[PDB]
Structure formats: structure tokens, C-alpha cells
């Protein structure tokens, strides 16, 4: 099935994202999709969930995500 998740920037006025995501998708997949939308190199970004640093291969099932939950997107400089 799918759950609705929100992605909000840690800083600034960038738009939040709302994605419908499969529960067997992983954190890394979410980050790939967010970075595709944001036009960002993946390694310039991290996602946190309730403040926690995340392993890319967590599924959203294993992490205990629920419909409506939010991840925070932390970004860095992009010229490296």
C-alpha cells in the first residue's frame, strides 16, 4: 500500500513536499526522490525522522512511519 509523508526543510523557506510512499520503500529511496524533486546531489542531503539520523536501508515499515508523518531535510553546500 502507500502512506502519505511530508518532507520539510530544516531551514529556510523552501517548499515542503508531500509524497505517497510504499511502506517497503527505504529512507534512501525517499532521499533519492526528494533530491530529484529539489535538483540536489544526494550526498548534500540527510533526512531525519523525529530528529533521528537514519540508515538508508531502513524501510518505512521498520522505522515505524505512519501516514501523515514528517521527515526533515538537512542540506549542505553543493559545489564539492
Author numbering: -1 to 78
Paper text:
The first complete archaeal Ub modifier system, including E2 and E3 enzymes, was discovered in 2011 in Candidatus Caldiarchaeum subterraneum. C. subterraneum Ub (CsUb), E1, E2, and E3 are organized in a single operon, adjacent to a second E3 protein and a JAMM protease (CsRpn11) with high sequence similarity to eukaryotic Rpn119. We have shown that CsRpn11 is highly active on its own, cleaving both CsUb precursors and, at a later stage of the ubiquitination cascade, CsUb-conjugated substrate proteins. Our bioinformatic, structural, and biochemical results reveal unique features of the archaeal proteins, but also remarkable conceptual similarities with their eukaryotic counterparts.
Fitting to the thermophilic nature of C. subterraneum, CsUb is an extremely thermostable monomeric protein (Tm > 95 °C in circular dichroism heat-denaturation studies). The CsUb gene encodes for a precursor of 87 amino acids (Ub-pre). We could solve the structure via molecular replacement using human ubiquitin as a search model, revealing for CsUb the classical β-grasp fold with a two-residue insertion in the first-loop region. Again, the closest connections to eukaryotic ubiquitin are made by sequences from Asgard archaea and Caldiarchaeum (dark violet, magenta; enlarged inset), CsUb being up close with 31% sequence identity.
